């Protein structure tokens, strides 16, 4: 029993965290095989963050301008190239702790674990979701750029995020491990602001199914709803539209509890209208949207 | 910026988790040097669990009755002994991934990370607090017994918890690594219940300081109070008493934000009396009490442990 925002064990990722230094800038890199991946703004000075010309800054660098430190061993760089917004530093030594891994670009509403790091040394691990506005609500201080997000499935680590910057509202933006930003953001110190955030509707429904599974039914009701009527109500609370894809993804949790998806949608509608009335659901006094249908099946019965 | 329930990196502990089987019962063990630590109830059947005599049950078991699996390698048991409620299995091979470590016993209100495991295979990590009633609100399914709680300081893993059992309210109970239970619990299938819990006052205040550090300032007011006056409020709302020791501990946050502790207790006092009035604090409608003062400082400073 119980229900916790659970992260994946971080050990396979700890083994790949290194420190990358260019000039006065130091941040984190991801050492897989003989390549070290880090944000390309490691090569920007103070003067460059407004309108950096990355091709022009990088052509002026040679391999020995990059200091890569793994533990207290120094790694020697033997090549460097840029892919979108990530720098790829070829090093002379393959990481002996390299896990089985792949790179995956995730969709809004997907969750992952974050290993927050500073100076190539891991600080802590926590669970996050990619918000509908393509930001994440993380916990990052100066020096954490290059921290990475991941899932683990059967000892294979799927890397899906690397941290690049904090937006003015205190939320965080980054790229996949191919250097493509999530959302409309750029590695530039320009005025950019996240779109209005919305609640991940399909995750809330899954978290409600999770509450039924741990034995709580107080919020159910005898009503049902059409898909479109539910979406007309839910968008008035800044909830994401719920699609037929979302309905199918919830099929298994529906069957395990015996509550049709559109019936649980009716329950959510009433919860949005009533509030919780001093009760809690899985220990929370708000509707929780950072567990996915997959996460719920993982942690529950 | 940002504030998240944050666990320590679990790598040093992942390398110590092994599966331990004795009969049908199979659970998780902690492998350090040449000893495997696990709950002593691994030797009991469901019949035995109702009124076990552990030394009698243990005098009958022999080394070969303990199947220890470190991943895919079998470890061979060459000895067995019992310290309080944990069983110590001497094994033939020292663990090459043994980190620097200590066994420590924590206090109610202190936090720790839990590496949840199943068949000696780690599956998740999360952050927990020892509640004043000596339970933890974890997330465990069957097969989790033997999972361990820890803190990391510098290079050293401080082991503080190992999971033994779930209570009927859905919360969890365990021992330290020397086998002493947290709270008035016994390792037998009997009628056991968590006592009434209370809220960890010093932790709520720490979390209010984290909110101020992160720009949530709406609950601050012009008022102040005294330790005596506040503690009367705390007892009324089922909060732990606030001691002068607690105030001293909150010092580095009171200075760093400019809000004195009794100044912040004035805010907490109003929050307990008047409610939240529709607003949130750090994205929560509840007053969070599972961040210690050290947790707040360390997350809002940047301390790393390689
Ligand atoms: O470089 C930074 C990355 N993340 C957060 C901050 Cl406040 C700074
Ligand atoms: O054997 C168990 C231990 N802890 C929790 C559960 Cl639900 C079962
Ligand atoms: Na005040």
UniProtKB/Swiss-Prot annotation, chain B:
Q: Which residues form the Peptidase C30 domain?
A: 1-306
Subcellular localization, as worded in the UniProt entry = Host cytoplasm; Host Golgi apparatus; Host nucleus
How might one describe the regulation of this protein's activity?
Inhibited by pyridone-containing alpha-ketoamides compounds 13a and 13b. In turn, alpha-ketoamide 13b (tert-butyl (1-((S)-1-(((S)-4-(benzylamino)-3,4-dioxo-1-((S)-2-oxopyrrolidin-3-yl)butan-2-yl)amino)-3-cyclopropyl-1-oxopropan-2-yl)-2-oxo-1,2-dihydropyridin-3-yl)carbamate) inhibits SARS-CoV-2 replication in human lung cells. Inhibited ex vivo by michael acceptor inhibitor N3. Inhibited ex vivo by compound 11a and 11b.
Q: What is the effect of changing residue 90 to R?
A: In strain: Beta/B.1.351
The listed outcome for residue 132 to H is:
In strain: Omicron/BA.1, Omicron/BA.2, Omicron/BA.2.12.1, Omicron/BA.2.75, Omicron/BA.4, Omicron/BA.5, Omicron/BQ.1.1, Omicron/XBB.1.5, Omicron/EG.5.1
Q: Give the residues annotated as active site.
A: 41, 145
Cytoplasmic side of membrane: 1-306
Give the position of the cross-link Glycyl lysine isopeptide (Lys-Gly) (interchain with G-Cter in ubiquitin). 5, 90
> Which reaction is this enzyme known to catalyze?
TSAVLQ-|-SGFRK-NH2 and SGVTFQ-|-GKFKK the two peptides corresponding to the two self-cleavage sites of the SARS 3C-like proteinase are the two most reactive peptide substrates. The enzyme exhibits a strong preference for substrates containing Gln at P1 position and Leu at P2 position
The record's subunit annotation is: 3CL-PRO exists as monomer and homodimer. Only the homodimer shows catalytic activity. Interacts with host FBXO22; this interaction promotes the proteasomal degradation of nsp5.
Please give the function described in this protein's UniProt entry.
Cleaves the C-terminus of replicase polyprotein at 11 sites. Recognizes substrates containing the core sequence [ILMVF]-Q-|-[SGACN]. Cleaves and inactivates human TRMT1, preventing tRNA guanine(26)-dimethylation of tRNAs. May cleave human NLRP1 in lung epithelial cells, thereby activating the NLRP1 inflammasome pathway. May cleave human GSDMD, triggering alternative GSDME-mediated epithelial cell death upon activation of the NLRP1 inflammasome, which may enhance the release interleukins 1B, 6, 16 and 18. Also able to bind an ADP-ribose-1''-phosphate (ADRP).
Q: What is this protein called?
A: 3C-like proteinase nsp5
Species source reads Severe acute respiratory syndrome coronavirus 2
The shown residues of the full protein are 3264 to 3569 of 7096
């Amino acid at each position: 029993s119980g229900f916790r925002k659970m992260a994946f064990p971080s050990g396979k990722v700890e083994g790949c965290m290194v420190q990358v230094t260019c000039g006065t800038t130091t941040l984190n890199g991801l050492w897989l095989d003989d390549v070290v991946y880090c944000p390309r703004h490691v090569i920007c000075t103070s003067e460059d963050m407004l309108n950096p010309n990355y091709e022009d800054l990088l052509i002026r660098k040679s391999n020995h301008n990059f200091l890569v430190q793994a533990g207290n061993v120094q790694l020697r760089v033997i090549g460097h190239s840029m892919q979108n917004c990530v720098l790829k530093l070829k090093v002379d030594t393959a990481n002996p702790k390299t896990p089985k891994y792949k790179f995956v670009r995730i969709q809004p509403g997907q969750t992952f674990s974050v290993l927050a790091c500073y100076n190539g040394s891991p600080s802590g691990v926590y669970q996050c979701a990619m918000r509908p506005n393509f930001t994440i609500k993380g916990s990052f201080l100066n020096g954490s750029c290059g921290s990475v997000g991941f899932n683990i499935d059967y000892d294979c680590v799927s890397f899906c995020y690397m941290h690049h910057m904090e937006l003015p509202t205190g939320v965080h933006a980054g790229t996949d491990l191919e250097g493509n930003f999530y959302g409309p953001f750029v590695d530039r110190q320009t005025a950019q602001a996240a779109g209005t955030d919305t609640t991940i509707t399909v995750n809330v429904l899954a978290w409600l199914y999770a509450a039924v599974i741990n034995g709580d039914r107080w919020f159910l009701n005898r009503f049902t709803t059409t898909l479109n009527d539910f979406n007309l109500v839910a968008m008035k609370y800044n909830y994401e539209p719920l699609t037929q894809d979302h309905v199918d993804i919830l099929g298994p949790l529906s069957a395990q509890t015996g509550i049709a998806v559109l019936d649980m949608c009716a329950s959510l509608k009433e919860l949005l209208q009533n509030g919780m009335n001093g009760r809690t659901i899985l220990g929370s006094a708000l509707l929780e949207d950072e567990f996915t249908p997959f996460d719920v099946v993982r942690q529950c019965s």
